[PDB]
Design a protein around this ligand. Structure first.
Ligand SMILES: Nc1ncnc2c1ncn2[C@@H]1O[C@H](COP(=O)(O)O)[C@@H](O)[C@H]1O
Ligand SMILES: Nc1ncnc2c1ncn2[C@@H]1O[C@H](COP(=O)(O)O)[C@@H](O)[C@H]1O
Ligand SMILES: Nc1ncnc2c1ncn2[C@@H]1O[C@H](COP(=O)(O)O)[C@@H](O)[C@H]1O
Ligand SMILES: Nc1ncnc2c1ncn2[C@@H]1O[C@H](COP(=O)(O)O)[C@@H](O)[C@H]1O
Ligand SMILES: [Mg+2]
Ligand SMILES: [Mg+2]
Ligand SMILES: [Mg+2]
Ligand SMILES: [Mg+2]
Ligand SMILES: [Mg+2]
Ligand SMILES: [Mg+2]
Ligand SMILES: [Mg+2]
Ligand SMILES: [Mg+2]
Lengths: 225, 289, 289, 225
RNA sequence: GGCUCUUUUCAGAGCC
RNA sequence: GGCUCUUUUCAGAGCC
């Protein structure tokens, strides 16, 4: 059974607040995409788009300080459904899921299980089926390098692999590009990154590594809920 | 003339900093190695000027950059017979696009589509040997119009011509003035206005590095810049990618890569060197004739 | 237009690099940490562009640096009585000059001359207590014109107004508008045009750091910048030095200290901030009238 | 018997070739002056002037790299006699030799006994009587800290006293400033620096330790030979 | 290489 | 503090 031909790295940036309150309703404000070719370990496509939040329109000073995304940036931006549509259109042009086997990769579980999960509700979109399974790279890294969860933060991962962060930290595209560097190194080291997490009934579950390598469905624009 | 959009940014940041507390100011100040001693209003003005210095330094960053934001590299592969007979009707069979960001100098997009020819549908032994494109590939492939639409869909997605200044870059004049020219006639498509002008890297390389025209071949250009060929030669996408490598090396060396060849009434002409640096229009899928 | 003097300097440099051997190129290019791989011509053009991107960049900011090169800090001490009586004729008793290089932010010159008063030749008890200047110091001192000459000689020697853009700077307006004004009258000297305008650092501090005029005293300005007084308070030279410490700090925080005050028909006037940054004329020893 | 009120640091830069040939005719190309107040241990005056050589007008590639002095800085520069006149004007203004007791100080002995000595002859000037004796700080440093001559190079002196060089080495001013830093530290350490070298009949001689602290005559612009 | 324009003319910018 | 100018207007530059 063959390996994924492509990996999509997605690192959402979202509205936020000092202290990171637990019950805060996050809204995606940046949608970066990095297409890594697993055969050649080259980045083939990078797509960055800012997302205009409808509920919390005005970004907090703390959010501006952390992510680097300005108010003007999210004002001149499309709304999430339009951004998502554009991201899928890129994925369809690359023929992911039809010609090439592919997976989604995120730095942790929140990106997909929280950010996308909540944003889709706020955008009145059904959860796109193609995004229900993914590679959590922290999970992979933790399992492959035998380190606790606490030692899997983006900075630390790069540090333990002889790398400095490349670009502006918390600029979604830059995080994705740096996550890509980890995914490359891990593949070079011999860890064939497997889909290890899933959304089922809206609650986060682990994907068994005993299960065969399975492709992510070809992406489709989810219909309005 | 504070009318520059950079100043509204500074106004937004200054107010953001005006809200900051003595501690927040002392914090973000230590973070930039700036002096931390003083009073609220001193620390406030100091940090505000740092962000002013930074933004203005950054916005005036026009070195190793082009006036175009993107350079869109295309190297068609077309049907061919051995010995290149004079009257063989060429058809594009590979449409690679390598989109290069001119500021970051990274390839932001690579895109490869194969094309099913409809005139000489059956590829030649030589053609297969040269391009490395199997008959099976062109058989499964879409019609040229369909492929062009896809290519345009990519350009529209990356906001070329609308939000970003861009131009097409070609190794030689053949791709646009011949292959696409002939192909559009065959596919009965009006020649797309976005492809009427472009950069000929051979022209650019020739009178930048002061080398004769016979020495501006793809393999030679690379061997001259002190680099070998990446991937399989005569393969569109890989050609384009290696072309993009030359393109970068030149922008780094400080070549203002400029549109040097237009096409007017099916006739290849050169664009004047002295004429103002102009950007390609936003791409549109051309209509049938 | 290309007719600028810099372009003839590049041509000699280009010819200098056109003679450089393939060994000399890879060596010099590595020294600038630039990529050294390639062929004779590629290395040649690459190095040629760096000397072009350096000499045009250096000459761009040569005319962009239209700010002063020197700030010339003077803080007169003058005769006075207890309680500052209204009709007491003031005479300058200390002429201190602190010359500050704005680029390096280092004090290049400290010069102190004492002056012998000829109206109220005997110093006040209060005056000596304040300024810390004994009778013996003024008795052995030269007359004001001889002192002004020596101060102008130092300014000519450092080439202020001829080779270097410069402005005088004082704590308050008193120094020029009151003390020097009264002194030139008394000495029967025409008021020197080089001192007809200056930087009042109190106006400059108050505007830059957003503080009331009541807060703009010398010891308070220092305190608000998180620094204590160096030397003996009310001692002209030491005052001038601490004023220079403020100037440096302000220049570091991004304040372009500009002339904001002038004399005109014996009246103190304010100078427009929007007015282009003009330097003081080269000093001249005034004639007697 | 009282000490000097001022120390007057001079570190000439001169025209030169690769390999420092012995018989070379040097021409002063930089005339820095650093005026140090011995009482307050503070630099009161800093004065740097470039000098246009008349014989060897073009600086060698080696000379330009060593000193950092560019050809054009030399072209626009005054000739030596004009530069010297200016330096003397400064010293007169500071009342050196009249009101205040002073000494010249150099890093080594060449500055006065070789550079100035030769440069005068080339400029048709008599040797300035005020420059006949000086403090060789390498001789002072070598005697006070009891190190061989080999360990008295400017950069080594700084390291031994826990210092890093400030600015560009072989730039006259920066040198003089750094030499003044050693001068200050040595005065702090307890070495009352005194004149230890002189010229007599164009011959380089030592000045005795036990000979009382004598000042240097007030500077005069020398008459043409 | 063949050219053609340019006080960047020990040099620059092109053209077939 | 009080004012005054300015599409840097959640800001900027000044004045008494
Ligand atoms: N320290 C933090 N405080 C508050 N929110 C955060 C913090 N770090 C990350 N976030 C939120 O998580 C999003 C993605 O961050 P990351 O997990 O670094 O990709 C950000 O856009 C924030 O909304
Ligand atoms: N030696 C050749 N003989 C015949 N056709 C060629 C040859 N080289 C290039 N071509 C044609 O030009 C197309 C692209 O090659 P290139 O112009 O080298 O990028 C190919 O698909 C061929 O149709
Ligand atoms: N409290 C005071 N009473 C009388 N005169 C003063 C007072 N403070 C300063 N002056 C005068 O202002 C001169 C210098 O002021 P300053 O430059 O502010 O130190 C002194 O020489 C005095 O003549
Ligand atoms: N390594 C060297 N080779 C040739 N000349 C030198 C060298 N070092 C110093 N000089 C000459 O001595 C002058 C200043 O010496 P110094 O004060 O020791 O840097 C320079 O301007 C040179 O002319
Ligand atoms: Mg993340
Ligand atoms: Mg992130
Ligand atoms: Mg080609
Ligand atoms: Mg090709
Ligand atoms: Mg004062
Ligand atoms: Mg004073
Ligand atoms: Mg020396
Ligand atoms: Mg030296």
């Amino acid at each position: 059974d063959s390996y994924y031909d492509y990996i999509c790295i997605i690192d959402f940036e979202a509205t936020c607040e000092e202290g990171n309150p637990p019950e805060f309703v996050h809204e995606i404000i940046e949608f970066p995409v990095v297409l890594l070719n697993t055969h050649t370990l080259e980045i083939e496509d990078t797509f960055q788009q800012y997302v205009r939040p409808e509920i919390n329109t005005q970004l907090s000073d703390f959010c501006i300080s952390l992510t680097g995304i300005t108010q003007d940036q999210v004002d001149r931006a499309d709304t999430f459904p339009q951004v998502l549509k554009k991201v899928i259109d890129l994925m369809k042009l690359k023929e992911l899921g039809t010609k090439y086997k592919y997976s989604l990769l995120t730095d942790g579980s929140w990106d997909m299980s929280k950010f996308l999960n909540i944003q889709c509700q706020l955008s009145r979109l059904k959860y796109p089926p193609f995004a229900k399974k993914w590679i959590n790279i922290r999970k992979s890294y933790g399992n492959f390098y035998k380190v606790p969860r606490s030692q899997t933060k983006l900075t630390i991962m790069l540090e333990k692999l002889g790398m400095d962060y490349d670009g502006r930290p918390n600029c979604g595209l830059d995080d994705s590009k740096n996550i890509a560097r980890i995914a490359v190194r891990m593949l070079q080291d011999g860890c064939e990154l497997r889909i290890n997490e899933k959304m089922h009934a809206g609650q986060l579950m682990s994907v068994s590594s005993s299960l065969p390598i399975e492709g992510t469905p070809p992406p489709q624009m989810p219909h309005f809920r | 003339d504070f009318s520059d959009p950079v100043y509204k940014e500074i106004a937004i940041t200054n107010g953001c900093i005006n809200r900051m507390s003595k501690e927040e100011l002392r914090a973000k100040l230590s973070e930039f190695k700036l002096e931390t001693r003083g009073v609220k209003d001193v620390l406030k003005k100091r940090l505000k000027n740092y962000y002013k210095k930074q933004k203005l330094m950054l916005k005036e960053s026009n070195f190793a950059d082009s006036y175009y934001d993107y350079i869109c590299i295309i190297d068609f592969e077309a049907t061919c017979e051995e010995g290149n007979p004079p009257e063989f009707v060429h058809e594009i069979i590979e449409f690679p696009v390598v989109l290069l960001n001119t500021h970051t100098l990274e390839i932001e997009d690579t895109f490869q589509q194969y094309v099913r020819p409809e005139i000489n549908t059956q590829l030649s032994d030589f053609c297969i040997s040269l391009t490395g494109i199997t008959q099976d590939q062109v058989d499964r492939a879409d019609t040229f119009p369909q492929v062009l639409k896809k290519v345009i869909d990519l350009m529209k997605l990356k906001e070329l011509g609308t939000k970003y200044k861009y131009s097409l870059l070609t190794d030689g004049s053949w791709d646009m003035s011949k292959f696409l020219n002939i192909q559009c006639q065959l596919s009965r498509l009006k020649y797309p206005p976005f492809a009427k002008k472009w950069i000929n890297i051979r022209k650019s390389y020739g009178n930048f590095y002061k080398v004769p025209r016979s020495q501006t071949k793809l393999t030679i250009m690379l061997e001259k810049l002190g680099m070998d060929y990446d991937g399989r030669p005569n393969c569109g996408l890989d050609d384009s990618k290696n072309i993009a490598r030359i393109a970068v090396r030149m922008l780094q060396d400080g070549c203002e890569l400029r549109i040097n060849e237009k096409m007017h009434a099916g006739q290849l002409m050169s664009v004047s060197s002295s004429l103002p640096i102009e950007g390609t229009p936003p791409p549109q899928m051309p209509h049938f004739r």
